[PDB]
Structures are given as C-alpha cells and as structure tokens.
Design an enzyme around this catalytic site. Structure first.
Site, PDB file in Angstrom:
ATOM      1  N   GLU A   1       0.843  -1.187   0.000  1.00  0.00           N
ATOM      2  CA  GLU A   1       0.000   0.000   0.000  1.00  0.00           C
ATOM      3  C   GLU A   1       0.875   1.232   0.000  1.00  0.00           C
ATOM      4  O   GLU A   1       1.777   1.366   0.833  1.00  0.00           O
ATOM      5  CB  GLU A   1      -0.997   0.003   1.147  1.00  0.00           C
TER       6      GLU A   1
ATOM      7  N   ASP B   1      -7.821   2.175 -13.059  1.00  0.00           N
ATOM      8  CA  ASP B   1      -7.719   0.729 -12.907  1.00  0.00           C
ATOM      9  C   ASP B   1      -6.884   0.126 -14.000  1.00  0.00           C
ATOM     10  O   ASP B   1      -7.122   0.384 -15.177  1.00  0.00           O
ATOM     11  CB  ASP B   1      -9.103   0.088 -12.929  1.00  0.00           C
TER      12      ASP B   1
HETATM   13 ZN   LIG Z   1      -5.636   2.974  -0.311  1.00  0.00          ZN
END
Ligand SMILES: [Zn+2]
Ligand SMILES: [Cl-]
Ligand SMILES: [Cl-]
Ligand SMILES: [Zn+2]
EC number: 6.1.1.11
Lengths: 495, 474
Positions: B327, B388
């Site tokens: 992340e 995306d």
């Molecule tokens: Zn995030």
C-alpha cells in the site's frame, strides 16, 4: 505418587439370536481369559470376563482390565470370536455401566465434561462413571477421557528455566525505556487496537535491518528457502498441531459473515448512519461462528503444505522460512511498550528431517545467532532451556521427557528496569520431536521417524533489546550494525 | 402521484391570558423565521403543544423557540409523512418504530426524548430515508490500451502452478500456501516495485497495523457499508483459563472444536481484519498538523495480509480471500497529489512495458472508497477517482474478461477530513493511494508468459536469478 492400580470395569450385553447355546460360550470365555485377552499385555495383565448371565435375545457379561487390553478394546475382540461361535454352528453392544478407577493423590473438582455421568474420590484415586455406548468405544472416548483426567491429576500435583550460556556483563550507558524514547522522538505511535503500534520510517528501518541480518547472516548460508504461510488459521490446522488442546484464552478469533447478501447487512449500515455508532451486538448476531483465529504460532499453517504426504529421502532436510505477516495474541492487560505487544512481526523458521538432521540443523542456528548477537548487534544476552513453546500454548507446563525435545530461550537485559529487572525473551529455538509429522500425518519414504524444529525471531523484541542497550542515536551503535542500516530516514515531523 | 412533507408533534412542557396571546404571535413571525410565508409552523406543571409544519424550521427547532419565549419537554407523538414513490421494503431503523407503507407515500413514526432532537435524530433518519427512497428512480471507460500481442501460453496459471508444485490451497476459504518457486516470484515483484518505483520516487517504508478497529473505519468511512465482506475479529471475553476449560475439555474428549459454545464465550467484534490497508495508517497523523516542509508525505507498507470475503466459487490466485499487497500512500496539496499520481503511472508504464512486457490497459472506474461503503457511479470532483489497470488472461479466450491487477486513486480531501489532519498554512490537504496486489500481478504475468523461465523477458529473469526448486512428494 499413588500406587493404586489403574483399572477398567465394563458391564455390557451382546445381541444372530438364540437362547441355549452355552457350551462354546463357556469355552470361549476361558479361551479368551487365558489366550485372546492376553495379547498385548505382559504376563498376567490381560483383560478378563469375571461373570456372565443370559436372556432370550441378549447375553450379558462383566468385564475387567488394567491399562493393557482395555475393556472397550477387549469387547470388540470378543464380538469377533463370539460372531464365529453362533454363525454356522447355531448384532450389537449395549452398556450397563462403565467405570474407570484412576490413581490420584488429591481431590479434583467436578467439571462439565461430556460422557461423564458422575465422579467421586476413593481409596488411592478417583472413580469415574462413564455414560457411553458402542460408538463411543470404537472411537476410544474412554481412552481420551483417561488422558484428560491424568493431565489434570498432574496439574494439581504441581515453571521451568535453567541456564545454558551467558555473556560477560557490559556497561549500560542508556538507561531509558526505548518505547518512551521512540515516542518522544517520532519513531512510532500507538495503533488504535490494544497492544498495537504504527511504525514510522525510523522504527521501520530498524525492523528491516534486523530482517536483512537474518537473511544474509543466517538464512542463506544455512540454505533456507522462503515460503509464504497463510495468516488466517482454521480449527483444522489447530486440531492437527494440538493448539486446539487449549490455546483458547490467547487468540484473536475470526468470524466470516454468514452471507454477502447486502440486504442482510442493510440493518447494520442504517444503525450507524442514524446513531453514528456501530452496533456490535447486532454484528455479533450476523457474523458466522468462528472459523479459527489470527496467526498465533506461525508454523502450524505451513504444515498443510506437507500434510498427508510422504517425502523422498533426497528431499530432506526441508528448510523453509516465512516473513509474510503479523501474528496476534491476547496478552495480559496493562499498557506496555514494544516489549509486550498483541500485534507482532516474526520471521518463522521451520525444518523437517531425521532426529539427527534436526538436531544438527538446530545446532547450526544456535551458532549463527551467537555470531549475530555477539558480533553484529553486540548486545548483552543469555540462553536457557525452558518450558517448550508447544507445551505452553497448549496449556501445560514442565518439560518433554525425551532428552533433547524442548525450547531454548534467548533473553536480554533492559537497563531501564534496573539491576533486578527481569530479562526479556527475544528469540527461541525448539526441537519439536515427532509431534508435527505425526499430527499432520507426514511420512518418510524409507520409513524412519520424521522430526521437526522451528525458531521464531520477534522483531519488536530485537528492537526493545537493541534499543534499551544502545539508545536511538546511531553514533553509539556498533559500527557493524551502522553499516547494515545505511543512512537513517527522517520521521514525519508534526507541529 | 406524489405528496408533501409534514412534521407533527404532541408534547408537554413540565415547568393563562398572557399564554393566550402567543398563538397570534408565534404563527405570525417567530416561527415563520427560516421559511417563506405560510409554511413556517393548532391545539392548545402541564401544558400541551400539538404542532404541524413543513420541511423548514422543523418541529424540534420550534419547541426550543417555545422553551425560550415561555419565560415571558416530554414527547408522546411524532409522525413524519414522507414524499415516497413506490411500495418499499420493511426496514428496522434505530429511532423508528412504525413504518406504514401507504398509497400516496410512506409514513414513519419515531420515538424520541428531548435529548434526541438536541442531537437531531429526525434529521439523520429523513436524510437516510430520502437517501434510500431514490433507489428506484460500476462505472468503466478506457483511457489507454497496449496493442495486441500473441499469446503462446493458453493455460490457467494456478492450475499450472499446482500441477508443477508451486503451491497448494491452504485450509481456509480462498487461501493459498506459496511454495519456494511461487514465493520467489512474489519477492521478485516486491524488488521490482521497490527498485523501479519506490526508491526512485522517494517513498519511506512504514509498518501499518493489520487488525482494524471500528474507530479507524468510522473515520475512513467504511463503517458506512463494508460489512458484507469483512472478516470480523473477536477477542476472548477473558483470558481466565477456568473460563475455557469447558471448551478445551470438549475438544480433548470428542475431537471436535465446539464452535457454537466458542461464539458464546468470545466478545463482540472489535473490528475486522485488514481490508483496504491504508485506513490504519491514518491513525499516525490523526489530529495532527504538518509544516509545509513535510509535504508531500510519501509513504508505503508491505507488512502483511489483507482479507476480504470474495464471491463464492473455486478460483485461482486471481480471486482470493487472503492477499498480499503493497500500500502506497501520499499526502499533499491538490497539485502535489496529482503530481505523484502522474509519477507512479509513468513508473508503472516502464515496469509493465519493459520489465514484465505484458499486454495491459488502464481505465477510469468507480472510486474504491465509494465501492467499499455500498456506493457506485463516479465522484463529483472531476479529478477525484480511481484508475484501474487490467490485463488479459489468454486462458480465458478471445472474449475473456480482463483481470484487474493494479489501481491508482486520487482520494480528494476525504482522508485528511475524516481523520482530521490539517496543514500548517491551512490549505486543504488531499491524498492518494495505490494498491499493488501481488497475486494479481502473479496471475497476469504467469498467464501471459508461462511458468518456464526460458520464455520470460530477459529483464525479468535477470531480477529473478536462478529459480529455487520446489518441495516434492511421492
Ligand atoms: Zn488505499
Ligand atoms: Cl498458528
Ligand atoms: Cl482497512
Ligand atoms: Zn514454530
């Protein structure tokens, strides 16, 4: 320490179905009492039918035994031969009462245990009245009830630690609690959850460096191949490892939703939007029953990789390790520092081989750890033989009665706790014996006993220890460490 | 056919002629306050006030105008007729009790004390009710695609990997054990992401927590609707071994863990396993203030596993319940957040084109934060949303649905506001993130190049080194 003989007392009846057939019935019982019921037990220690009578459909008998050839095993030996009496010459088992007399020194308080009708003290031990049918006896439930009752007999008759090696003491010029120091200087903060911490860049570089040290100074020279063990652990895994025998008070339990159907969850959502409170009670009712818990010991779930398998001799020692995630344990209340967290980070190391290969592997790790702690970290520490990690996490104390099976703990001092401070454990190495192979049913091609071992390196604990002894200023660290770290990163400065 | 809005309350004050003058008064100017003529706001120890109204200067912001002038509260009725469209499902909502479903709309009947309008409960319920009603009145669109490549490997990489000893299913739903070979691939991506993206762009490693508590999700906004796919976590009600002896003894005797009994002995859930990964980081900066010398904060985590309860079925690594993600999180002003966004896209392009050499595309989709709290569509701030990354899995065929392996989001001011992070100058902070799903990278690469190193791109092989051998059985 009570010499009362362990004894079993069965009162049962069989049920094709005539009435007068007793010639062979008499002759079978003697041909059992001095032959069939003998096999397994030593001389004069086999089971015995002590009396019997009859009905028109049923054939009742009293049966007795000690620890070998037990009544619930003996009775199936009987049905087998008694089935070949009135087969061509001329259906089930019921239980009138099942009694076990177990030796014990002390009284033991009655508990909610299944298949136990009553229990009370007698001369020299304890008498149990079991509430069991034939199904139970095939399952060996009486055997398991006896293992339980003994575990608890040991427990009542009642922690282990003894030195193996210690370092010459060192001057300790940093005398503060590292967690307080790190909080004051921007290294970390508390996570939202209990026993949880958020590691800023400075702290994180320490963990990464420790990690790197394990990879280059231990894991590669020794031949360990990285794997990725899963972190959600299920009852299936804990049944086979044995943790299902009593880990319950210390795990974080996981429950999946009963369904993804968002209409089923619509009610939760709404509560929150109106009250700005999460309805935890309502959620508890909508979540499934627990499927297990968060990673507790780290190796257990690796063993699904090799469960039900055989290993070629060319393929051992299997030397693997994992560093893919967090372990979670519900520790004692009271706020702590990084020295006692609930969410921790560990490099789990595991090896399978023969008794001998396993010990050799264990010795090799001990060697590489001594180099690291003496030469690279340059810290003050020691190691002691202790109560095994598998024994403890499964409720029980003492040691294992095989010479070399157990755990060796590494402990370091924390100068901020003072001269009489309890030292901190930060590293372990364990020889597990045949436990894990047996439990997951992992066999060996050439047919010898498979043994395993494991070692866990808790990063939070290396940090507690290294920082309590050296401080947070790099200038005072061992210069061998300071090379590994490169240049220390800046924290996120707030106003 | 539609109707109006009326509020109606019956309430008494617990504290004759002068009182009789206030009827003319209140209905003239005092309660025609925050509402144009007419709508503003009937029947007269114990007084009793019945009062109708419209949408504006509500009954509960009108019984406190009475509380004031009466110098010169207990409720037994409160009804809200609501301009509803069609027949609607029956819902249990905290401060409601009746939910009559009439022909002209929907009538509701709340139950409140005086210490329930001070906090404005009818406000939220109506807001909710109206937010719901309009129910009966994902987004996707291409940005860039790479031109076609030939696809010499036509097999499901997970099926391949299992046949070829790379991995087996772990005990839990959607869960995998990675053997040495598969573990290496993961670590190779990690080292690509670090060396090619993270180090060059100046991101510092932090360790984010992995057990998330409601407070985090309350602030991050997932507590609005993430429930259907959380793995809930419950501590023991107590560590007292005497409280567990019944569980243990049940197992030891029967060889089955008693999951019903256990559910009874464990506490209410404190929250859930890591879902989005970034939320728990924000506790590190919550309530804080950043000097401008500090922005952009550019930070990342790779300390463990995320868990989601995915849709039912047997899937390969392309759809799992336990996953490993990196992340990546940045905070700065709008402009800085948009710049990092662009730096990453640029670095992903290099990775995907000329390290991995895959066929891929990127599209503008539904913001991840919206999706994960029950919502769909787009964000109303044109620069706020998710990009995306998708790739084709040849084994799926020419009509095959492409798989999502990567995203990059501009979150707007959402996280700084939820967690209350100001900037020293008081310009609005913004944030962004990017999740690197390793199984997803591992599903694309391998479905496109196979499991045999001979046919991977040189740039990749170089970084992989010599493949570890697997563990073999009889
Ligand atoms: Zn995030
Ligand atoms: Cl575990
Ligand atoms: Cl999350
Ligand atoms: Zn272990």
């Amino acid at each position: 320490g009570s010499h009362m003989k362990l004894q079993f007392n069965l009162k049962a009846y069989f049920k094709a179905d005539p009435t007068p057939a007793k010639d062979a019935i008499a002759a079978l019982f003697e041909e059992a009492n001095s032959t069939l019921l003998t096999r397994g037990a030593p001389e004069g220690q086999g089971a015995k039918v002590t009396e019997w009578k009859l009905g028109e459909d049923r054939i009742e008998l009293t049966l007795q035994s000690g620890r070998y050839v037990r009544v619930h095993d003996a009775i199936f030996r009987l049905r087998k031969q008694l089935a070949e009496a009135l087969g061509k010459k001329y259906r089930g088992i019921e239980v009138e009462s099942f009694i076990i007399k177990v030796p014990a020194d002390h009284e033991l308080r009655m508990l909610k245990v299944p298949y136990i009708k009553s229990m009370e003290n007698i001369e020299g031990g304890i008498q149990l009245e079991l509430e069991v049918g034939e199904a139970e006896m095939k399952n060996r439930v009486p055997d398991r009830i006896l293992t339980l009752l003994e575990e608890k007999i040991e427990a009542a008759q009642y922690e282990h630690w003894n030195l193996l090696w210690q370092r010459e003491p060192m001057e300790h010029p940093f005398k503060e609690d590292p967690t307080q120091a790190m909080m004051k200087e921007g290294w970390l903060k508390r996570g939202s959850s209990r026993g949880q911490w958020i590691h800023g860049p400075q702290s994180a570089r320490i963990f990464r460096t420790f990690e790197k040290i394990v990879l280059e100074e231990l894991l590669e020279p020794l031949g360990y191949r990285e794997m990725i063990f899963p972190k959600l652990v299920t009852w299936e895994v804990w049944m086979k490892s044995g943790h299902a025998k009593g880990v319950y008070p210390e795990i974080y339990y996981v429950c999946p939703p009963q369904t993804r159907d968002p209409d089923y969850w619509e009610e939760v959502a709404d509560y929150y939007k109106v009250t700005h409170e999460v309805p935890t009670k309502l959620i508890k009712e909508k979540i499934a029953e627990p499927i297990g818990g968060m990673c507790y010991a780290q190796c257990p779930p690796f063993w699904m990789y090799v469960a039900g398998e055989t290993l070629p001799n060319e393929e051992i020692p299997v030397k693997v390790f994992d560093r893919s995630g967090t372990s979670h344990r519900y520790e004692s209340g009271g706020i702590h520092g990084i020295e006692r967290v609930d969410e921790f980070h560990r490099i789990e190391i595991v090896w399978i081989g023969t008794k001998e290969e396993v010990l050799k592997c264990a010795e090799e790790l001990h060697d590489r750890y001594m180099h690291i702690f003496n030469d690279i970290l340059d810290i003050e520490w020691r190691k002691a033989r202790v109560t095994p990690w598998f024994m403890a996490q499964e409720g029980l104390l003492g040691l294992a009665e095989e010479n070399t099976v157990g755990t060796t703990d590494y402990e370091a001092c924390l100068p901020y706790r003072g001269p009489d401070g309890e030292w901190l454990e930060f590293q372990n190495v364990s020889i597990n014996g045949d436990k894990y192979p047996k439990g997951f049913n992992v066999k060996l091609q050439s047919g010898d006993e498979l043994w395993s071992g494991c070692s866990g390196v808790g990063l939070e604990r290396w940090a507690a220890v290294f920082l309590a002894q050296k401080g947070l200023d790099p200038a005072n660290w061992p210069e061998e460490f300071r090379n590994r770290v490169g240049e220390m990163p800046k924290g996120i400065r707030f106003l």
